[PDB]
Design a protein around this motif. Sequence first.
Motif, PDB file in Angstrom:
ATOM      1  N   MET A  14      10.677 -23.459 -15.091  1.00  0.00           N
ATOM      2  CA  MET A  14       9.821 -24.224 -15.999  1.00  0.00           C
ATOM      3  C   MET A  14       9.671 -25.679 -15.555  1.00  0.00           C
ATOM      4  O   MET A  14       8.558 -26.205 -15.533  1.00  0.00           O
ATOM      5  N   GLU A  15      10.788 -26.314 -15.192  1.00  0.00           N
ATOM      6  CA  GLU A  15      10.777 -27.682 -14.658  1.00  0.00           C
ATOM      7  C   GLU A  15       9.820 -27.809 -13.473  1.00  0.00           C
ATOM      8  O   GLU A  15       9.025 -28.752 -13.399  1.00  0.00           O
ATOM      9  N   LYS A  16       9.910 -26.853 -12.551  1.00  0.00           N
ATOM     10  CA  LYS A  16       9.077 -26.832 -11.351  1.00  0.00           C
ATOM     11  C   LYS A  16       7.600 -26.580 -11.659  1.00  0.00           C
ATOM     12  O   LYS A  16       6.726 -27.190 -11.045  1.00  0.00           O
TER      13      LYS A  16
ATOM     14  N   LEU B 230       6.010 -27.312 -14.457  1.00  0.00           N
ATOM     15  CA  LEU B 230       5.458 -28.464 -15.168  1.00  0.00           C
ATOM     16  C   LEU B 230       5.465 -29.766 -14.369  1.00  0.00           C
ATOM     17  O   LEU B 230       4.545 -30.577 -14.494  1.00  0.00           O
ATOM     18  N   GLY B 231       6.505 -29.976 -13.567  1.00  0.00           N
ATOM     19  CA  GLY B 231       6.720 -31.282 -12.960  1.00  0.00           C
ATOM     20  C   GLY B 231       7.129 -31.299 -11.503  1.00  0.00           C
ATOM     21  O   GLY B 231       7.363 -32.371 -10.949  1.00  0.00           O
ATOM     22  N   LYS B 232       7.213 -30.117 -10.892  1.00  0.00           N
ATOM     23  CA  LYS B 232       7.642 -29.960  -9.493  1.00  0.00           C
ATOM     24  C   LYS B 232       9.097 -30.394  -9.294  1.00  0.00           C
ATOM     25  O   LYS B 232      10.025 -29.633  -9.577  1.00  0.00           O
ATOM     26  N   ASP B 233       9.282 -31.626  -8.828  1.00  0.00           N
ATOM     27  CA  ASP B 233      10.611 -32.176  -8.557  1.00  0.00           C
ATOM     28  C   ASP B 233      11.176 -32.983  -9.730  1.00  0.00           C
ATOM     29  O   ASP B 233      12.310 -33.470  -9.668  1.00  0.00           O
ATOM     30  N   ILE B 234      10.386 -33.124 -10.792  1.00  0.00           N
ATOM     31  CA  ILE B 234      10.815 -33.863 -11.978  1.00  0.00           C
ATOM     32  C   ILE B 234      11.674 -32.974 -12.878  1.00  0.00           C
ATOM     33  O   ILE B 234      11.274 -31.863 -13.236  1.00  0.00           O
ATOM     34  N   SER B 235      12.857 -33.473 -13.233  1.00  0.00           N
ATOM     35  CA  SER B 235      13.772 -32.765 -14.131  1.00  0.00           C
ATOM     36  C   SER B 235      13.265 -32.848 -15.570  1.00  0.00           C
ATOM     37  O   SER B 235      12.447 -33.714 -15.892  1.00  0.00           O
ATOM     38  N   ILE B 236      13.755 -31.964 -16.438  1.00  0.00           N
ATOM     39  CA  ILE B 236      13.309 -31.955 -17.839  1.00  0.00           C
ATOM     40  C   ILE B 236      13.693 -33.244 -18.576  1.00  0.00           C
ATOM     41  O   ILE B 236      12.908 -33.766 -19.370  1.00  0.00           O
ATOM     42  N   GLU B 237      14.889 -33.761 -18.288  1.00  0.00           N
ATOM     43  CA  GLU B 237      15.334 -35.034 -18.855  1.00  0.00           C
ATOM     44  C   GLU B 237      14.337 -36.152 -18.558  1.00  0.00           C
ATOM     45  O   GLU B 237      13.971 -36.914 -19.453  1.00  0.00           O
ATOM     46  N   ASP B 238      13.892 -36.235 -17.305  1.00  0.00           N
ATOM     47  CA  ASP B 238      12.919 -37.243 -16.889  1.00  0.00           C
ATOM     48  C   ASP B 238      11.527 -36.958 -17.451  1.00  0.00           C
ATOM     49  O   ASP B 238      10.822 -37.880 -17.873  1.00  0.00           O
ATOM     50  N   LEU B 239      11.138 -35.682 -17.467  1.00  0.00           N
ATOM     51  CA  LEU B 239       9.858 -35.284 -18.044  1.00  0.00           C
ATOM     52  C   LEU B 239       9.781 -35.650 -19.527  1.00  0.00           C
ATOM     53  O   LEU B 239       8.727 -36.083 -20.000  1.00  0.00           O
ATOM     54  N   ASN B 240      10.896 -35.474 -20.240  1.00  0.00           N
ATOM     55  CA  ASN B 240      11.017 -35.897 -21.636  1.00  0.00           C
ATOM     56  C   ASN B 240      10.718 -37.383 -21.790  1.00  0.00           C
ATOM     57  O   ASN B 240       9.946 -37.781 -22.667  1.00  0.00           O
ATOM     58  N   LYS B 241      11.341 -38.194 -20.935  1.00  0.00           N
ATOM     59  CA  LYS B 241      11.148 -39.641 -20.974  1.00  0.00           C
ATOM     60  C   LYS B 241       9.697 -40.000 -20.660  1.00  0.00           C
ATOM     61  O   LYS B 241       9.087 -40.814 -21.357  1.00  0.00           O
ATOM     62  N   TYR B 242       9.151 -39.379 -19.617  1.00  0.00           N
ATOM     63  CA  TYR B 242       7.759 -39.598 -19.224  1.00  0.00           C
ATOM     64  C   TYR B 242       6.782 -39.260 -20.350  1.00  0.00           C
ATOM     65  O   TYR B 242       5.875 -40.036 -20.659  1.00  0.00           O
ATOM     66  N   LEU B 243       6.962 -38.086 -20.952  1.00  0.00           N
ATOM     67  CA  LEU B 243       6.037 -37.610 -21.975  1.00  0.00           C
ATOM     68  C   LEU B 243       6.148 -38.423 -23.259  1.00  0.00           C
ATOM     69  O   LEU B 243       5.134 -38.760 -23.876  1.00  0.00           O
ATOM     70  N   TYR B 244       7.378 -38.753 -23.643  1.00  0.00           N
ATOM     71  CA  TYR B 244       7.604 -39.652 -24.764  1.00  0.00           C
ATOM     72  C   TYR B 244       6.866 -40.973 -24.549  1.00  0.00           C
ATOM     73  O   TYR B 244       6.195 -41.465 -25.447  1.00  0.00           O
ATOM     74  N   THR B 245       6.975 -41.528 -23.346  1.00  0.00           N
ATOM     75  CA  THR B 245       6.347 -42.808 -23.031  1.00  0.00           C
ATOM     76  C   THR B 245       4.826 -42.667 -22.969  1.00  0.00           C
ATOM     77  O   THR B 245       4.091 -43.526 -23.475  1.00  0.00           O
ATOM     78  N   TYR B 246       4.369 -41.574 -22.363  1.00  0.00           N
ATOM     79  CA  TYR B 246       2.940 -41.289 -22.262  1.00  0.00           C
ATOM     80  C   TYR B 246       2.298 -41.196 -23.642  1.00  0.00           C
ATOM     81  O   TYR B 246       1.277 -41.837 -23.900  1.00  0.00           O
TER      82      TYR B 246
ATOM     83  N   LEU C  61       5.034 -26.645 -23.708  1.00  0.00           N
ATOM     84  CA  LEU C  61       5.902 -26.049 -22.703  1.00  0.00           C
ATOM     85  C   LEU C  61       7.104 -26.931 -22.380  1.00  0.00           C
ATOM     86  O   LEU C  61       8.187 -26.421 -22.093  1.00  0.00           O
ATOM     87  N   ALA C  62       6.913 -28.248 -22.417  1.00  0.00           N
ATOM     88  CA  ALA C  62       8.024 -29.170 -22.181  1.00  0.00           C
ATOM     89  C   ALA C  62       9.058 -29.077 -23.303  1.00  0.00           C
ATOM     90  O   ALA C  62      10.272 -29.073 -23.040  1.00  0.00           O
ATOM     91  N   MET C  63       8.583 -28.982 -24.547  1.00  0.00           N
ATOM     92  CA  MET C  63       9.467 -28.739 -25.692  1.00  0.00           C
ATOM     93  C   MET C  63      10.266 -27.462 -25.471  1.00  0.00           C
ATOM     94  O   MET C  63      11.488 -27.448 -25.624  1.00  0.00           O
ATOM     95  N   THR C  64       9.559 -26.400 -25.089  1.00  0.00           N
ATOM     96  CA  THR C  64      10.153 -25.090 -24.873  1.00  0.00           C
ATOM     97  C   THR C  64      11.216 -25.132 -23.772  1.00  0.00           C
ATOM     98  O   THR C  64      12.260 -24.497 -23.895  1.00  0.00           O
ATOM     99  N   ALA C  65      10.950 -25.903 -22.717  1.00  0.00           N
ATOM    100  CA  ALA C  65      11.852 -26.000 -21.568  1.00  0.00           C
ATOM    101  C   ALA C  65      13.216 -26.595 -21.920  1.00  0.00           C
ATOM    102  O   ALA C  65      14.213 -26.314 -21.249  1.00  0.00           O
ATOM    103  N   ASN C  66      13.254 -27.407 -22.975  1.00  0.00           N
ATOM    104  CA  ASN C  66      14.500 -28.015 -23.447  1.00  0.00           C
ATOM    105  C   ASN C  66      15.459 -27.023 -24.089  1.00  0.00           C
ATOM    106  O   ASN C  66      16.607 -27.363 -24.387  1.00  0.00           O
TER     107      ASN C  66
END
Length: 366
Positions: A57-59, A61-77, A42-47
């Motif tokens: 979609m951002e909300k 998956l992540g509530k207040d987290i933007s897709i740009e930040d979610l990308n960074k988080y998931l990449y790191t995770y 879903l994060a891939m799709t949101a991009n």
Amino acid sequence: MEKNIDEKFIYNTADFSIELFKNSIDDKENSLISPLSAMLALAMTANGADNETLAQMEKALGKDISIEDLNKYLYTYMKKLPNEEKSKLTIANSIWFKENDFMPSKDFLQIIADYYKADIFKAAFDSSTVSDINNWVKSKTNGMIDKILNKIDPEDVMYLINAVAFDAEWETVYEKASVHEDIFTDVYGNRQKVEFMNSEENLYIEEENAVGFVKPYAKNHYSFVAILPDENISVNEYIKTLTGQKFIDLIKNAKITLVRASLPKFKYEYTIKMNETLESLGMTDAFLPDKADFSKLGKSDIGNLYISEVLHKTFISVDELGTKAGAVTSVDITFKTVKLNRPFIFAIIDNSTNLPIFIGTVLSLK
């Protein structure tokens, strides 16, 4: 590209995970989902989304987290999720697009290649594409999930797919002396044998209307959480009370104490359509042909893109040696005989965060 896993990511992802779980529960069949797998697809799709489709979609998956930040988080995770002998966890992402009818955007493909390490398939979308996709899912789940589709619909131009494969040994495997055949009557009134596995564990879960334990896999990167609702609450009502906060807390609050634990050997598969759950999380526009905005994905020659179905397939096998679990989540791809009187909830958790890689229910065996 990196963003350190922090309390915001943990508790936000925990909320998504538990909301996903509590809305994916079958009434009679054993359930199993991988929130990680769902998140990644879903994060891939949101991009590829813009405007209201993206904001929803951002909300979700992540509530207040933007897709740009979610990308960074998931990449790191994904970068930091341990993957060792006896403690294996591999993740695979892919995009499949119909070369004749769809031109993907370079920015989208770059984000997906960079943050999600996605295999990019320019495909014909015929019967041979079906074979290719299924071979991909079979390979990436080490045979745990062999098929995700049988046919390709004429309207289809892009699929996004995630796979997660988990294969771990117990820190202490169950010796023969610790495994016993127990007698159960099945739904048809016939007697058959189920093997139950005895251990001593050192983390005791104790909450309102529930007890349980945490059992470590080799090298302690992952553990198995077992939760047993008591006679004064149903499995469904217990699950209704769960929140991301409550899930993280019940693991954190587990008491260091010796527990005599018993776990049945179990194996099952689960398939669920996630559309309605996702719509309840606020993701509605993405599913609407006239409202969906996936303009950032690229250009389709057959009109505006929208999500038809989000499909989730999972598999688990728990035995004397350990646990193998698999999941696939796809975007745009369109019975157990022994009823337990002590059903239970379980999770495979990442010990660095307490996040559930897999979470499910065992209502029945055999």
